RNA sequence: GUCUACGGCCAUACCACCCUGAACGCGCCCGAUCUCGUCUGAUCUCGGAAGCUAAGCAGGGUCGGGCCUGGUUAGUACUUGGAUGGGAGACCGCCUGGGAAUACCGGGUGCUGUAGGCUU
RNA sequence: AAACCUCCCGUGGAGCAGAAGGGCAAAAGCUCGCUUGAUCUUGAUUUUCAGUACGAAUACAGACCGUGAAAGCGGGGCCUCA
RNA sequence: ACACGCAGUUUUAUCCGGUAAAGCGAAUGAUUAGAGGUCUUGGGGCCGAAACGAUCUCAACCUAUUCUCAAACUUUAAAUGGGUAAGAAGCCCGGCUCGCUGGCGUGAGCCGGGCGUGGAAUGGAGUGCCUAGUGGGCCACUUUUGGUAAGCAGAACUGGCG
């Protein structure tokens, strides 16, 4: 059986990438995290304090509490029967903003603009997204040149 | 010979440090603690007073840090002193005190708190702190950023700090490193500090050198002989400079214009020129080789 | 017409390596204080060696560094002892050189039954103005590529300044 | 003495080389991986004759040594002592284990029994280079060496010039234009990315 | 066009050698009474402006190394799902989708925020 | 070849008590100066988990402090067990 | 004649990994052979009293190459896979409270007002009490550990017998 070590199996997970060791860049230290902000957790081996557990690496959660240099994040975790919404304390260096919600926010702003606009025009615009439709039948023009033949290549042993 | 330490693999695995670290300008270990604000505020700037004593100038600035880059909210320079009266001695303790006072007064004038928090007008050298007055906007708070300077007793960064705190800025500090503290007695004299603030050390050296050797006096204080500044006039010159600084600290940036826009440097060579140059060198070498 | 490329003496290094214990090293330090005029410091052993009779953190040798005109005068005395004779191997590739003297009595120090004969090693560090960049605190940098002292230039400087008679081999 | 090669023919385990963890490994049977006139130039022995396997199996070091001995002996008999160069391109690194029964299957982890080489499909086993007139002798030597190995392997003569990675037809043109510089057993390729001093060293 | 102070991303920014620097600025540099610390004012600290681009520094050059970004390698290696497919097996082909990495060959060799100078 | 001194190169190939892994260069290594945050007290959370204990740890808060010019750091050991 | 909410699904965005592969002319370790090196020193030797004077050789090294590898190596690096988002519990304004933080400011919490189909396709969902039996499993495609192998022992996903 395996040991119950906290950092077991984190040989490469909690390791700085190639030629990116040394001093932690200060941009990550001066980013604010309001309540209700969607945040994805990625552990960093340079900082040992505030280290999240290996099971939360790569997970995404919501910020509910803030301290001097750490925030509280509620992250869903599945334990063999169910998903548990549990809260953990993670330091800032292992915390970055998630870019999944910004696309939705941008689309919401664009939809609000398209709702305020074209309203006095009277023409309803398509606001819902749609999957890729058929490829809109067209014409292919082979001006002059005929299509090139592609015969199979006879086999030869190269090794 | 030797085994070449700097092989191809040496550069392949070489991880350069930060640009400021390579240039030897920024101590990121201290900057992390000086700059970063607590997360539970979410907007409050962390103002710091950066003091850099150059070879022929003193730079005092106040700034807060942002992701795109720290913004300088106010600045003061030692070369601005001749406008206020200090013609010579731009890199002494008194110059640092004057620059700090100028920075503090200019920031207070910009923020509209010029009348409140007048600070210490009668300079004495004792420890002085500015207490916020109830019912009034709070006193400006910032922290001293020494940089890479070795903070010992008598460093001019603390002279700029004393000037700033006398200007009316609430900067947390102690009297340990002010000139006048005794290491062997753990007591502060507060009179030697006034001598250094008023430039009395320079005047004493000037008198001593004039008494000792005339040639050494001429060489050490060649520009002090010009402009007619004497050790007898130093204290009143500095007092008048302080009064003028407190009267009007505003800046009057000159209207730069009329630029010829000429390339003083060397423009970069294009790819085609490089390829043609190497081909021409090959051809010239072939032609010269087919001679002997 | 080089403006600031004149070779100068950065420092002169003097050391005596007695390396047994105590009083002999103290006498060597007395000789160093008599000659250099400054109180020297004691150097401890890096690790224990049984053959040499030394132990870890045991004070073996005493050394002193002299700079300025005093270093020049001490070098004048030491080189006058050596009859201005150096060799090619005595010159290093970094632009520095040195020599040893078997007895310090030739320098001008009276002998004593208690403080007897102690030889010492001289080492001269040459340089140019602007060499303080590599050892200053904030904006440390290397001293160019054409600014460093070469071995042949050090040989010529010694040949001209001290009237060298260096011999091959 | 040792178990039949049928036991350790297939690649069943992960590679198990000799290292800090695996110690006490007996020395491999094959020690000389190339012999003949190995002190020869590229231009004199262009044949590039290869023996390529067709099975993902394991070849024992003893089989490699026996095949090398047989091929070298036949090549010396046919062409001459210094008229060829034979190179073995397989090194036994995988270590097989032996669970010797004088306890049952409890604690069954074998000690290092020997060394074996893992071979992929189409991988070159043995290579011989010599003059063009010895093509029949090369193919006969490789056919004889085939019987010292299990599985099925083919005999092929490639278009490369000797033990080099450049085609024989284009080799002479590259040498004439000094793109290729002979260097011992192999050849050296110089690109145009080098400093002009290196180019100036040649063409003069 | 460019520099100084504080920075952001941390080599397109690094390393080796060579050439050029008008002005401000940055430094070399001149000394140790006062502040300060050393075996040595070498470092640090303080007091200055007689000389200089010698060096740092800035720009440029190397059929330069490295680094960043592309083509080739290659629809190759590998791989999700399928078969009462082949083969004694080892393994392999096909159907349905995804799709690499060396060697080799090209391009480039820092952008930028705040405040303050010079070219007026 | 190994005693001490000097210069240069040196991405860390040394050291950080231990087994190994991760991490660290004006440090987290070496030398100094001062101290005992290895102090007292409520809660919240993380690891195994049944999501129960023990041990270990993580962000806080309330007092007494230490240190540094200060920003800050520290309620034991750089982290993963003792 | 009139739909909220949830999914062993997919799509559009946005994060995570270090396995397959590949590399060792890049780090660590293993390892073959030729060219240039008194780089370094040393053993046998030969021409030499000796000589880094000529010639090779075996030692560990270097300078550009070359053959083969790594479950406890790695610059790169998949397919498959794992988290989130796809709106009413959301946005846009106005005003109050704060023994918190702040130069003015923040930040949070309270009230008032205005704006509704937020990708595809399928399901009606949510919630509370008691509760028996079970707690010896086995087989197969695929991945995989020990063993020569086993109708052998032991793991992962899925499907079956039970
Ligand atoms: Mg500091
Ligand atoms: Mg506390
Ligand atoms: Mg593999
Ligand atoms: Mg049953």
Curated annotation (Swiss-Prot), chain A:
Transmembrane segments: none annotated. PROSITE patterns: RIBOSOMAL_L21E (PS01171). One of its GO terms (molecular function) is structural constituent of ribosome. Keywords: Cytoplasm, Endoplasmic reticulum, Ribonucleoprotein, Ribosomal protein. Residues 111-122, 135-144 have a biased composition (Basic and acidic residues). Belongs to the eukaryotic ribosomal protein eL21 family. Component of the large ribosomal subunit. This is Large ribosomal subunit protein eL21. It comes from Oryctolagus cuniculus. The gene is RPL21.
From Swiss-Prot, chain B:
One of its GO terms (cellular component) is nucleolus. The keyword Cytoplasm applies. It comes from the Eukaryota. Residues 251-292 are annotated as: Disordered. Pfam families: Ribosomal_L18_c (PF14204), Ribosomal_L5e (PF17144). One of its GO terms (biological process) is translation. This is Large ribosomal subunit protein uL18. It comes from Oryctolagus cuniculus (Rabbit).
Curated annotation (Swiss-Prot), chain C:
One of its GO terms (cellular component) is ribosome. GO terms for biological process: translation. The modification Phosphothreonine is found at residues 36, 39. It is found in: Nucleus, Nucleolus; Cytoplasm. There is a cross-link at residues 30, 44, 146 (Glycyl lysine isopeptide (Lys-Gly) (interchain with G-Cter in SUMO2)). Keywords: Acetylation, Cytoplasm, Isopeptide bond, Nucleus, Phosphoprotein, Ribonucleoprotein, Ribosomal protein, RNA-binding, rRNA-binding, Ubl conjugation. Component of the ribosome, a large ribonucleoprotein complex responsible for the synthesis of proteins in the cell. The small ribosomal subunit (SSU) binds messenger RNAs (mRNAs) and translates the encoded message by selecting cognate aminoacyl-transfer RNA (tRNA) molecules. The large subunit (LSU) contains the ribosomal catalytic site termed the peptidyl transferase center (PTC), which catalyzes the formation of peptide bonds, thereby polymerizing the amino acids delivered by tRNAs into a polypeptide chain. Component of the large ribosomal subunit (LSU). Part of the 5S RNP complex, which is a LSU subcomplex composed of the 5S RNA, RPL5 and RPL11. Component of a hexameric 5S RNP precursor complex, composed of 5S RNA, RRS1, RPF2/BXDC1, RPL5, RPL11 and HEATR3; this complex acts as a precursor for ribosome assembly. Interacts with PML. Interacts with MDM2 (via its RanBP2-type zinc finger domain); negatively regulates MDM2-mediated TP53 ubiquitination and degradation. Interacts with NOP53; retains RPL11 into the nucleolus. The gene is RPL11.
From Swiss-Prot, chain D:
The gene is RPL10. Citrullinated by PADI4. Ufmylated by UFL1. Transmembrane segments: none annotated. Belongs to the universal ribosomal protein uL16 family. This is Large ribosomal subunit protein uL16. Gene3D superfamilies: 3.30.60.300, Ribosomal protein L10e/L16. It is found in: Cytoplasm. The modification Citrulline is found at residue 31.
């Amino acid at each position: 059986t395996n040991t119950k070590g906290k950092r077991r199996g984190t040989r490469y997970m909690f390791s700085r990438p190639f030629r990116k060791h040394g001093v932690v860049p200060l941009a990550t230290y001066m980013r604010i995290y309001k309540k209700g902000d969607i945040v994805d957790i990625k552990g960093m081996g340079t900082v040992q304090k505030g280290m999240p557990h290996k099971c939360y690496h790569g997970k995404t959660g919501r910020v509910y509490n803030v301290t001097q240099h750490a925030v509280g994040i509620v992250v869903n975790k599945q334990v063999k029967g169910k998903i548990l919404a549990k809260r953990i304390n993670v330091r800032i260096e292992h915390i970055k903003h998630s870019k999944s919600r910004d696309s939705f926010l941008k689309r919401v702003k664009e939809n609000d603009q398209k709702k305020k606009e074209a309203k006095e025009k009277g023409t309803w615009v398509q606001l819902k997204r749609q999957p890729a439709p058929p490829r809109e039948a067209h014409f292919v023009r082979t001006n002059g040149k005929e299509p090139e033949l592609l015969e199979p290549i006879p086999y030869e042993f190269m090794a | 010979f030797v085994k070449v330490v700097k092989n191809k693999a040496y550069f392949k695995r070489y991880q350069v440090k930060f640009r400021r670290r390579r240039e030897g300008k920024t101590d990121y270990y201290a900057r992390k603690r000086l700059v970063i604000q607590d997360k539970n505020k979410y907007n409050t700037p962390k103002y710091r007073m950066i003091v850099r004593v150059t070879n022929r100038d003193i730079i005092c600035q106040i700034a807060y840090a942002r992701i795109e880059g720290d913004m300088i909210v106010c600045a003061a320079y030692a070369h601005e002193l001749p406008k206020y009266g200090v013609k010579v001695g731009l890199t002494n303790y008194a110059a640092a005190y004057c620059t700090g006072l100028l920075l503090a007064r200019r920031l207070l004038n910009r923020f509209g708190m010029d009348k409140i928090y007048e600070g210490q007008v009668e300079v004495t050298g004792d420890e002085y702190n500015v207490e916020s007055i109830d019912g009034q906007p709070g006193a400006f708070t910032c922290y001293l950023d020494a940089g890479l300077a070795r903070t010992t007793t008598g460093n001019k960064v603390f002279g700029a700090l004393k000037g700033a705190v006398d200007g009316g800025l609430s900067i947390p500090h102690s009297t340990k490193r002010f000139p006048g503290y005794d290491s062997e007695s753990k007591e502060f004299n507060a009179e030697v500090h006034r001598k250094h603030i008023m430039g009395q050390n320079v005047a004493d050296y000037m008198r001593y050198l004039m008494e000792e050797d005339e040639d050494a006096y001429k060489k050490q204080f060649s520009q002090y002989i010009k402009n007619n500044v004497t050790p007898d006039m130093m204290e009143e010159m500095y007092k008048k400079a302080h009064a003028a600084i407190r009267e009007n600290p505003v800046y009057e940036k000159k209207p730069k214009r009329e630029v010829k826009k000429k390339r003083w440097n060397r423009p970069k060579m294009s790819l085609a020129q490089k390829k043609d140059r190497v081909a021409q060198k090959k051809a010239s070498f072939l032609r010269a080789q087919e001679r002997a | 017409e080089n403006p600031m490329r004149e070779l100068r003496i950065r420092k002169l290094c003097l050391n005596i390596c007695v390396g047994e214990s105590g009083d002999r090293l103290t006498r060597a330090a007395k000789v160093l204080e008599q000659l250099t005029g400054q109180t020297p410091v004691f150097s401890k052993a890096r690790y224990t060696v049984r053959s040499f009779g030394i132990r870890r953190n045991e004070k073996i040798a005493v050394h002193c560094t002299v700079r300025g005109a005093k270093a020049e005068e001490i070098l004048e005395k030491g080189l006058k002892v050596r009859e201005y004779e150096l060799r090619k191997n005595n010159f290093s590739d970094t632009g520095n050189f040195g020599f040893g003297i078997q007895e310090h009595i030739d320098l001008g120090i009276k002998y004593d039954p208690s403080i007897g004969i102690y030889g010492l090693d001289f080492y001269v560090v040459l340089g140019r103005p602007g060499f303080s960049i590599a050892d200053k605190k904030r904006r440390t940098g290397c001293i160019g590529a054409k600014h460093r002292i070469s071995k042949e230039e050090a040989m010529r400087w010694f040949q001209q300044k001290y009237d060298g008679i260096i011999l091959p081999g | 003495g040792r178990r039949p090669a049928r036991c350790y023919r297939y690649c069943k385990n992960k590679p198990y080389p000799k290292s800090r963890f695996c110690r006490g490994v007996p020395d491999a049977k094959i020690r000389i991986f190339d012999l003949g006139r190995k002190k020869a130039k590229v231009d004199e022995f262009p044949l590039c004759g290869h023996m390529v396997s067709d099975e993902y199996e394991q070849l024992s070091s003893e089989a490699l040594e026996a095949a090398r001995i047989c091929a070298n002996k036949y090549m010396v008999k046919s062409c001459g002592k210094d008229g060829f160069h034979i190179r073995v391109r397989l090194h036994p690194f995988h270590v097989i284990r032996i669970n010797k029964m004088l306890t049952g299957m409890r604690g069954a982890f074998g000690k290092p029994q020997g060394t074996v080489a893992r071979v992929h499909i189409g991988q070159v086993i043995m290579s011989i280079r010599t003059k063009l007139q010895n093509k029949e002798h090369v193919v006969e030597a490789l056919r004889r060496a085939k019987f010292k190995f299990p599985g099925r392997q083919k005999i092929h003569i490639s278009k490369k010039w000797g033990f080099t990675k450049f085609n024989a037809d284009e080799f002479e043109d590259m040498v004439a234009e000094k793109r290729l510089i002979p260097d011992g057993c192999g050849v050296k390729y110089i690109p145009n990315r080098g400093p002009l001093d290196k180019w100036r060293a040649l063409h003069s």
